[PDB]
Amino acid sequence: QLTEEQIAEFKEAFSLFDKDGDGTITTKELGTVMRSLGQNPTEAELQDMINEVDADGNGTIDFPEFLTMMARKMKDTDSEEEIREAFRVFDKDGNGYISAAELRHVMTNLGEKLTDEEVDEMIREADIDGDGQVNYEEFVQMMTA
């Protein structure tokens, strides 16, 4: 399921964290690796993987084991890889919130025919908080309804 290009990218990342070159990373380095991949595992999920890949008590994680963990992560993606990536076309600055100005910029970039009032209304409809912006939770809720 993983492509050889994804595999080469993961090899570059792993080598960047396998600084001493022994072919393995330690079990505490793994948390940092995963957070540096732009992924957000819960400490529970992290500890689970930790104890699983280090069942033999050797502390070491080689590159095939890292790839296996990544494959299992790819299939266990909470089936929301589309909504996560669709959020990012609107959150231009990547700060975790879609602002009315950001939505306006997108709807003008992509040639959509909405007025600035229609854009404000998309925002106010999706913005359940009423804080003026759309967070990821609100975006997901709007999408799944």
Partner 1 sequence: SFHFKEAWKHAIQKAKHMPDPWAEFHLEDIATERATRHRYNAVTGEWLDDEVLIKMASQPFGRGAMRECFRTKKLSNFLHAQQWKGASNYVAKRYIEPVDRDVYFEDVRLQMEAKLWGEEYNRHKPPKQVDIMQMCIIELKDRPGKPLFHLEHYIEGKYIKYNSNSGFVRDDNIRLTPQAFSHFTFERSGHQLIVVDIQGVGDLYTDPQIHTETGTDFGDGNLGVRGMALFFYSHACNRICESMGLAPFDLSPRERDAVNQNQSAKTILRGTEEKCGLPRASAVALEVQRLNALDLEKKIGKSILGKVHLAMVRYHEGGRFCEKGEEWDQESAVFHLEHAANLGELEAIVGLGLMYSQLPHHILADVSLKETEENKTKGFDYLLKAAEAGDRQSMILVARAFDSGQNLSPDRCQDWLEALHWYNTALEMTEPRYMMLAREAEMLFTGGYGLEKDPQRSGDLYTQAAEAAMEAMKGRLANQYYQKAEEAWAQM
| Contact residues for Ca ion, defined by CB under 5 A | 91, 93, 95, 97, 127, 129, 131
The nearest distance, CB 22 to Ca ion, in angstroms, is 41
22 binds Mg ion (CB under 5 A): yes
Give the phi and the psi of residue 93 in degrees, each rounded to 5. Answer: -80, -10
Q: Which run of H or E residues covers position 64?
A: helix 63-75
Instruction: Calculate the dihedral angle through the C-alpha atoms of 107, 95, 30, 65, rounding to the nearest 10 degrees.
Output: -10
Give me 133's structure tokens.
């912006």
Distance of CA 79 to the CA centre of its chain: 12
* Contact partner at residue 29 from Ca ion, Mg ion, partner 1, none, CB < 5 to 8 Å by partner kind: none
Comparing CB distances to Ca ion, the nearer of 35 and 124 is 124
Using DSSP's 3-state secondary structure scheme, residue 94 falls into: coil
Q: Which residues bind partner 1 (CB under 8 A)?
A: 6, 9-10, 12-13, 16-17, 32, 35-39, 70, 73-74, 77, 81-82, 85-86, 88-90, 92-95, 99-102, 104-112, 114, 116-118, 120-122, 125-126, 132, 142-143, 145
The Cα–Cα gap between 14 and 61 comes to 10
Among 5, 12, 20, 78, binds Mg ion (CB under 5 A): 20
Give the total residue count for the chain. 145
* Contact partner at residue 1 from Ca ion, Mg ion, partner 1, none, CB < 5 to 8 Å by partner kind: none
